[PDB]
Design a protein around this ligand. Structure first.
Ligand code: HEM
Ligand code: HEM
Ligand SMILES: *[C@@H]1O[C@H](CO)[C@@H](O[C@@H]2O[C@H](CO)[C@@H](O[C@@H]3O[C@H](CO)[C@@H](O)[C@H](O)[C@H]3NC(C)=O)[C@H](O)[C@H]2NC(C)=O)[C@H](O)[C@H]1NC(C)=O
Ligand SMILES: *[C@@H]1O[C@H](CO)[C@@H](O[C@@H]2O[C@H](CO)[C@@H](O[C@@H]3O[C@H](CO)[C@@H](O)[C@H](O)[C@H]3NC(C)=O)[C@H](O)[C@H]2NC(C)=O)[C@H](O)[C@H]1NC(C)=O
Ligand SMILES: CCCCCCCCO[C@@H]1O[C@H](CO)[C@@H](O)[C@H](O)[C@H]1O
Ligand SMILES: O=C(O)C1=Cc2cc(Cl)cc(Cl)c2O[C@@H]1C(F)(F)F
Ligand SMILES: O=C(O)C1=Cc2cc(Cl)cc(Cl)c2O[C@@H]1C(F)(F)F
Ligand SMILES: *[C@@H]1O[C@H](CO)[C@@H](O)[C@H](O)[C@H]1NC(C)=O
Ligand SMILES: *[C@@H]1O[C@H](CO)[C@@H](O)[C@H](O)[C@H]1NC(C)=O
Ligand SMILES: *[C@@H]1O[C@H](CO)[C@@H](O)[C@H](O)[C@H]1NC(C)=O
Ligand SMILES: *[C@@H]1O[C@H](CO)[C@@H](O)[C@H](O)[C@H]1NC(C)=O
Lengths: 552, 552
């Protein structure tokens, strides 16, 4: 019934009803005018001509390795390029944030209520005739059918980019600080009220939890020593709430910042590494500042680890994922003469797209062992069994699954994939093609264009009938990958903006924060500016084993 | 003992201890270098020469009325000037915010914990030898002594700028949405978690309170009709908590957004006016949007009232206070090509400086009556007695007290003034002169320079001994006024930055919000862009009585 149900307004124009069956588009600052904001302004037409497609740019970034080799070595050139990747991306994100699952129009409630995930696109109104607005049938295709026909893995498909298990578990661990759905409220709600990289997954969401985790000497976090090795403390010792099945012995109930991290030994591996890093940085700071107390050692270390985290995410993690020959750089100063909002709100869609479960192998291979999901889940004995060094060595060698390209979701986790589909609908997501437009990409004109093949395309076509009715989440996992890449166009073009915004939007990246004194001086500052996934493991894992995010 | 106790670093350089008795200043981006950031960079020296003092600029703004008359009528010129007043002010505020009462160094706790007021200057460390750091005696002068000698009113001193009671009560009402100290926690904590102009003082801090206040038809707020006039509903009808002495009859316990607003009839006057405005705007929107439901009518109206509020504050309220011949403008677009953070955190110091109780008269004069404080407080019968029209007429005629200049704090409220002194100290405020430097003003070199007279100066000198030990709050109320002005230099130069930042930092001022559709279309948008204190009163008060922030 809502006359905006067809999503009439193009180019980021906003639709507003002007009567029971009339609408109007607000084209303010879109660069277009006309009833649906589809008539371009002169200068807009120019820009459109001189604008290369994302696939073109991606090609240039992943080719001409010889040129990039030169560029990467000319500091002012590298800075110029990175500044452009930062700025071009962030303009795609609304900041201050706008919509959420309950508000398809701006409101103080949607702005002020931090318990919601924000929305890059507003929900389809409740009184629209179809799930996607006006197109398609009264009901989307059976989600089980979609799951089984195009999502579920038959044979394991490895990632051509060589992503390993160190990568997979880093992705899970890192993102699960800001992807923390409040299932008590619903899929559109979050428990991560910092809406970003605050390391609550190490330190805790709340002050009370943090204090239980802290030693209150030398700024350190509590820990225990088992077989000469440092591990997180127990629930019994700390009284912090953790999720564990009832059969887990108390001496194996490790207590960490994120209550869910005991559920996978790969998570507990990173939990342990970072715990160690924190206490390590505490020793460094105490040496520089024998005058400092516990609070200041703890707080400064946390700030340093936030910096290390962002550093590693950009220059190692995203570097690997991108396949760019251009060398990405973590440098807050690049934005100082630029318009940029030092804030962020986690988007529901960012969460949805990040369900990268195809990464998971059929078994987890540590040393001589090959563990099944059943044996791997909630099983910290495995970690104690082999130890950190062996986890790193093994996980660095084991290849992860390809994410886009279709049919690679492990059966063990099929319920999670079905829930991603069902909850997207529950949250009234607009279609894949609406999202594509929202991020300046060309709508797909057929299912075959989407997948780049014929078989899955045909199954999808029989299910959905209309490409404009296809759903974002299934599309992401079925999309034609970039050549020999882990992802297709839509994953990168939505993901990159959300990501860089949450990284650079952090307050430590602001001018008043980004200076040596913030981090206890030049020594603390250097820890951030030289951080890497390798140094993180070298300093904190016995034997300083070699590591990487790609299979060697 | 802390080597930074003496506030060694100048020009916004940051002090960090580097050993039990050594310190270092971080001069990053200050424009200076050297041990204490006192050596200017070349370009810094230039700028310093070409920079007029705040007193010079103030003079130019309050003179040459004939030129301003021309400028005010050249749209592009007016915009240019207002853009400059906006930008020059906001660079004085740290955003994202930094310190608070418990953290004299940056921390994630101080950044993330919204329950604290932020701090423009860090607190004096607990182990410093004197209250102000290293200067002065082990103890500040008796606050009762300061109160009595230089703060308390002997004879009422009227405001030379002609501020009236409409102004006084607007200031109280408006600011008490973001000045809401959480006395359960301490003076450095706030209950206003929106940290700005969110109109929680009309709508409530929390969703629960809001819903009790709402009618849930046509987007409106509950109300009652008494003698044909619209007033807020009762506590009995709504169950919203309000602070009222036990002797107040339930039918006089008006329920409004801000629990403390029943305490002064002048507050309840504005509460009633704004309640009316909201329901008024609801009627307008319903007429434009018969398709809209209650939620959308309510939320859109709230957004419109936020706009009206900022509009009136800049163009009427601040316009009056400034004494400028230049016509200030509320125009978000002025910042769109500028670097600016659409966020804000309420500063403790902004709260402290806004204790403008000298505004209060010895009696409140309504019609033929002259009420004492005793009779005026918690007495809503007076409002019912005379009605809104008579309140507006009377309060528009009654002159308010001068704030700076000394000895004009009403005795009835002496406990509040003493608390301002005592709580400042409790919160470990740095000295007046530190705050002056912090806002690019020249330190006062004597008490006589501060007051511009001899008698109070001599009393202050005997009390404090050293000008560098003088306190911010008492200094503000004792400072030499600008010629025939309500305030001295320090009030304006600290207040203006804090204020404009909270006004323009509101999300509705951001590009994605500042468009017609946000406000239900051109008709809702116009309500904001034509708002004035006179139109607010004219649309909402019977007879459309004349009003102004100044005596006629
Ligand atoms: C290691 C084995 C893993 C298991 C057993 C697992 C299982 C689960 C389960 C049961 C959920 C809840 C979904 C629902 O609401 O129905 C979930 C959520 C999620 N998973 Fe995984 N997962 C694993 C690894 C990963 C990996 C490698 C990633 C990639 C980054 C990932 C990304 C996510 C995300 C982003 C969520 C949503 C988090 C939230 O909103 O709270 N997971 N996972
Ligand atoms: C009209 C009669 C007034 C009375 C009886 C009054 C009394 C008080 C009292 C008792 C407090 C502290 C109470 C507490 O801490 O809970 C206070 C605080 C304050 N007053 Fe007034 N006042 C009046 C008018 C004004 C006016 C006209 C202004 C001008 C802006 C003003 C500005 C403030 C501010 C900014 C605070 C701090 C509030 C907070 O942080 O929560 N007051 N007043
Ligand atoms: C962010 O938005 C959330 C969604 O609106 C808010 O969560 C909801 O708050 C409501 C008000 O407290 C709850 O309403 C329920 O209403 C009935 C009738 O009065 C009562 O019986 C219930 O006690 C009351 N609450 C509950 C828990 O039943 C909603 O239930 C509650 N939860 C959800 C998911 O809607 C958040 O409050 C809001 N956050 C803030 C800071 O405002
Ligand atoms: C913003 O910072 C505030 C000030 O530090 C936090 O407020 C404090 O939280 C503490 C617990 O989280 C309370 O301490 C008390 O500690 C003992 C030890 O376990 C408990 O028994 C008490 O129950 C607990 N609380 C009380 C009321 O006794 C502090 O009292 C409390 N208030 C103050 C003034 O410190 C806020 O929690 C923090 N806000 C957020 C969002 O983190
Ligand atoms: C009213 C004209 C006198 C003003 C000068 C005040 C000198 C300080 O006098 C004080 O006045 C307070 C208020 O009455 C009293 O509570 C104190 O007991 C008294 O010391
Ligand atoms: O943070 C992330 O996961 C990513 C950040 C990222 C950022 C740029 Cl610029 C380019 C790529 Cl390929 C990126 O890859 C991913 C993504 F986008 F989500 F797939
Ligand atoms: O918001 C306020 O109260 C004010 C804002 C304000 C803003 C400018 Cl530009 C100039 C003046 Cl005189 C102002 O006066 C006051 C103040 F600063 F608090 F005294
Ligand atoms: C927008 O496109 C044209 C107006 O030029 C109109 O025919 C069309 O119906 C409008 N909206 C939609 C969804 O078709
Ligand atoms: C957990 O792993 C341990 C040690 O590797 C193994 O002995 C045990 O069988 C596992 N438990 C489950 C439930 O698979
Ligand atoms: C800063 O000024 C000079 C260093 O140039 C030095 O004499 C002084 O002691 C330093 N600090 C203070 C507080 O004086
Ligand atoms: C309250 O106001 C009434 C009526 O205006 C007045 O007569 C009365 O004296 C006041 N109450 C008190 C306690 O002063």
């Amino acid at each position: 019934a809502n006359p905006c149900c067809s999503n009439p307004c193009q180019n980021r124009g906003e639709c507003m009803s002007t009567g029971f069956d009339q609408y109007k588009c607000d084209c303010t600052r879109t660069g277009f005018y006309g009833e649906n904001c589809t008539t371009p302004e002169f200068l807009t037409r120019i820009k459109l001509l001189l604008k290369p497609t994302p696939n073109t740019v991606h090609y240039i970034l992943t080719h001409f390795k010889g040129v990039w080799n030169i560029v990467n070595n000319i500091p002012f050139l590298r800075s110029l390029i990175m500044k452009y990747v930062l700025t071009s991306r962030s303009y795609l994100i609304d900041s201050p944030p706008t919509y959420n699952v309950h508000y398809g129009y701006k409101s103080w409630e949607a702005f002020s209520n931090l318990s919601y995930y924000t929305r890059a696109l507003p929900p389809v109104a409740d009184d629209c005739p179809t799930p996607m607005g006006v197109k398609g049938n009264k009901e989307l295709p059976d989600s089980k059918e979609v799951l089984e026909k195009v999502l579920l893995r038959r044979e394991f498909i490895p990632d051509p980019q060589g992503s390993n298990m160190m990568f997979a578990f880093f992705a899970q661990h890192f993102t699960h600080q800001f992807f923390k759905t409040d299932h008590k409220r619903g899929p559109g709600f979050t428990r991560g009220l910092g809406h970003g990289v605050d390391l609550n997954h190490i330190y805790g969401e709340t002050l009370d939890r943090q204090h239980k985790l802290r030693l209150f000497k030398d700024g350190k976090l509590k820990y225990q020593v088992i077989g000469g090795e440092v591990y997180p403390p127990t629930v019994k010792d700390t009284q912090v709430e953790m999720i564990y099945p009832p059969h887990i012995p108390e001496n194996l109930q490790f207590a960490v910042g994120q209550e869910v991290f005991g559920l996978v030994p790969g998570l507990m591996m990173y939990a342990t590494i970072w715990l160690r890093e924190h206490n390590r940085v505490c020793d460094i700071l105490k040496q520089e500042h024998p005058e400092w107390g516990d609070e200041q050692l703890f707080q400064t270390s946390r700030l340093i680890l936030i910096g290390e985290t962002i550093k590693i995410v950009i220059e190692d993690y995203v570097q690997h994922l991108s396949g760019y020959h251009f060398k990405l750089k973590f440098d807050p100063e690049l934005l100082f003469n630029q318009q940029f909002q030092y804030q962020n709100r986690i988007a529901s869609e960012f969460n949805t797209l990040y369900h990268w479960h195809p990464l998971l192998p059929d078994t987890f291979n540590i040393e001589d062992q090959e563990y099944s999901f059943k044996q791997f889940l909630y099983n910290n004995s495995i970690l104690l069994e082999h130890g950190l060094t062996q986890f790193v060595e093994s996980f660095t060698r084991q290849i992860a699954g390809r994410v886009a390209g279709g049919r690679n979701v492990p059966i063990a986790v099929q319920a999670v994939a079905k829930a991603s589909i069902d909850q997207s609908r529950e949250m009234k997501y607009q279609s894949l093609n609406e999202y594509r437009k929202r991020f300046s990409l060309k709508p797909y004109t057929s299912f075959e264009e989407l997948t780049g093949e014929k078989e899955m395309a045909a199954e999808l076509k029989a299910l959905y009938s209309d490409i404009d009715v296809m759903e974002l989440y299934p599309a992401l996992l079925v999309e034609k990958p970039r050549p020999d890449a882990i992802f297709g166009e839509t994953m990168v073009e939505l993901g990159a903006p959300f990501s860089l915004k949450g990284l650079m939007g952090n307050p430590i990246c602001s001018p008043q924060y980004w200076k040596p004194s913030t981090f206890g001086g030049e020594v603390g500052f250097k820890i951030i500016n030289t951080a890497s996934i390798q140094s993180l493991i070298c300093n904190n894992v016995k034997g300083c084993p070699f590591t990487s995010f790609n299979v060697q």
